[PDB]
Amino acid sequence: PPPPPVYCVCRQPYDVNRFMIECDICKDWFHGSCVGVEEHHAVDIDLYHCPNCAVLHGSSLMKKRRNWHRHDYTEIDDGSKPVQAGTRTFIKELRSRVFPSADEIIIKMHGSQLTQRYLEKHGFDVPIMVPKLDDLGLRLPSPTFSVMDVERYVGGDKVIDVIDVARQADSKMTLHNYVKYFMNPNRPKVLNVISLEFSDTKMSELVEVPDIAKKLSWVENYWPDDSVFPKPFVQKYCLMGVQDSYTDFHIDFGGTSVWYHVLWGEKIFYLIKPTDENLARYESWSSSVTQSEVFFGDKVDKCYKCVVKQGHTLFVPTGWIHAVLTSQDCMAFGGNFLHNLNIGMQLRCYEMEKRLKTPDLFKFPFFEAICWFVAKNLLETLKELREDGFQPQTYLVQGVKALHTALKLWMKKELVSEHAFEIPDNVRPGHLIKELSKVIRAIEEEN
Numbered sequence: 451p452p453p454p455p456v457y458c459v460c461r462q463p464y465d466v467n468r469f470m471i472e473c474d475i476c477k478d479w480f481h482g483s484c485v486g487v488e489e490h491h492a493v494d495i496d497l498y499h500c501p502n503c504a505v506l507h508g509s510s511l512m513k514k515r516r517n518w519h520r521h522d523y524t525e526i527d528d529g530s531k532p533v534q535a536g537t538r539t540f541i542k543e544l545r546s547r548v549f550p551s552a553d554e555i556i557i558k559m560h561g562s563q564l565t566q567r568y569l570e571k572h573g574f575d576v577p578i579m580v581p582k583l584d585d586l587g588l589r590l591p592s593p594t595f596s597v598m599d600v601e602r603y604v605g606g607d608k609v610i611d612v613i614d615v616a617r618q619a620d621s622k623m624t625l626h627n628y629v630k631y632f633m634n635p636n637r638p639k640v641l642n643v644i645s646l647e648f649s650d651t652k653m654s655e656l657v658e659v660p661d662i663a664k665k666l667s668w669v670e671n672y673w674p675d676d677s678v679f680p681k682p683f684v685q686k687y688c689l690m691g692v693q694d695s696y697t698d699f700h701i702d703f704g705g706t707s708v709w710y711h712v713l714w715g716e717k718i719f720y721l722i723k724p725t726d727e728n729l730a731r732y733e734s735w736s737s738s739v740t741q742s743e744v745f746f747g748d749k750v751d752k753c754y755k756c757v758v759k760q761g762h763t764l765f766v767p768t769g770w771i772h773a774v775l776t777s778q779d780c781m782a783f784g785g786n787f788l789h790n791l792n793i794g795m796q797l798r799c800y801e802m803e804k805r806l807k808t809p810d811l812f813k814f815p816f817f818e819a820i821c822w823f824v825a826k827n828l829l830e831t832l833k834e835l836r837e838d839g840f841q842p843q844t845y846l847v848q849g850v851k852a853l854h855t856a857l858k859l860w861m862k863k864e865l866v867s868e869h870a871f872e873i874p875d876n877v878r879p880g881h882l883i884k885e886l887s888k889v890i891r892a893i894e895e896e897n
């Protein structure tokens with residue numbers, strides 16, 4: 451009559467969906483939550499000793515630090531091995547570097563002026579800075595809002611993704627434990643939260659994205675209600691990071707444009723323009739094996755340092771390559787959106803993510819799906835303008851044409867196999883491409 455197999459001090463049966471750690475003394479397994487060990491602490495622990503065993507054997511044996519510049523702080527500090535991203539020395543070095551002020555390129559303006567008419571007329575190809583909050587239609591919680599409040603609304607037991615910035619590695623924590631950590635002024639490690647999307651929490655009630663962002667948003671103007679696919683939520687994000695948190699260079703998923711508002715603290719963006727040259731150097735860099743050892747900002751001609759003060763709102767347009775340094779403990783809200791202003795580049799960025807085989811969960815949920823719905827509606831628009839007297843605006847045409855090129859490419863016999871599952875069973879792929887080709891031919895003719 452063998453006893454049912456249970457583990458941990460809670461004498462519970464094994465659950466494969468829960469993080470556990472092995473005690474080197476008793477050989478049993480323990481739930482991180484039962485013994486107070488976070489998933490990100492596992493890499494620090496050399497040999498784990500559970501509380502009970504610790505009474506006579508002492509605490510766990512931790513790995514010894516010999517670094518300040520390598521992801522694996524155990525490597526000997528002999529001279530070989532370059533400085534890696536997000537480490538203490540890296541940050542020190544990053545803070546000493548000299549960059550061209552982002553003032554040379556970004557546009558600063560009043561919220562009331564930032565409209566779709568303005569964007570269509572002058573384009574949206576450089577970052578836009580909006581010092582004051584007035585006229586953005588951007589509603590956020592009081593500047594006094596604290597992490598304890600984030601916990602109060604969202605929910606203490608919610609599971610979020612944390613980033614051990616000095617290792618550039620991900621793990622998971624409950625929002626409660628993250629707050630406990632953030633609240634302790636003395637943090638033995640730099641942790642950063644950047645993917646806590648709360649549009650489905652009681653905290654959504656408090657935030658309201660910028661009008662321009664909603665006015666432009668693809669999901670907001672083209673994603674149907676009668677959709678079989680699940681509507682994407684990348685509109686409301688809560689960002690919390692302690693000082694010296696770092697995010698290496700990247701291009702937001704799906705070539706989406708984004709908005710950031712620092713409630714309190716100070717974020718520092720390192721902006722790189724989306725030139726063909728740079729976009730190539732980036733795609734190489736983001737795949738090279740020495741990535742973590744090369745500060746990409748050096749592989750290009752100009753890297754702009756944009757300091758975002760608390761109270762300010764920044765807008766980064768499609769394609770821009772950027773890294774972010776957290777000058778000080780900060781909490782900021784932000785969001786991503788796709789729009790017509792730069793249809794071509796968005797597709798360009800999407801094609802690039804596909805080649806870098808960036809993980810599934812690290813992309814934009816249903817990129818192709820939305821692209822279909824858009825092509826569809828734009829067909830009705832371009833057509834309704836023709837049968838109405840006016841000729842479409844240059845950009846929209848340049849864009850619908852790029853989208854046209856894209857849809858045709860996905861249907862291509864040797865390719866339709868992968869882009870197949872992504873088509874909405876609400877659209878006639880071959881049909882849209884035909885009707886779209888003529889309106890394009892028509893427009894191209896009249897002009």
Ligand SMILES: O=C(O)CCC(=O)C(=O)O
Nearest residue numbers: 644689691697774775776
């Ligand atoms: O949290 C940060 O310091 C930067 C986050 C960021 O740039 C992003 O999520 O795209």
Ligand SMILES: [Fe+2]
Nearest residue numbers: 700701702772
């Ligand atoms: Fe970003």
Ligand SMILES: [Zn+2]
Nearest residue numbers: 473476500503
């Ligand atoms: Zn033990």
Ligand SMILES: [Zn+2]
Nearest residue numbers: 458460481484
């Ligand atoms: Zn347990």
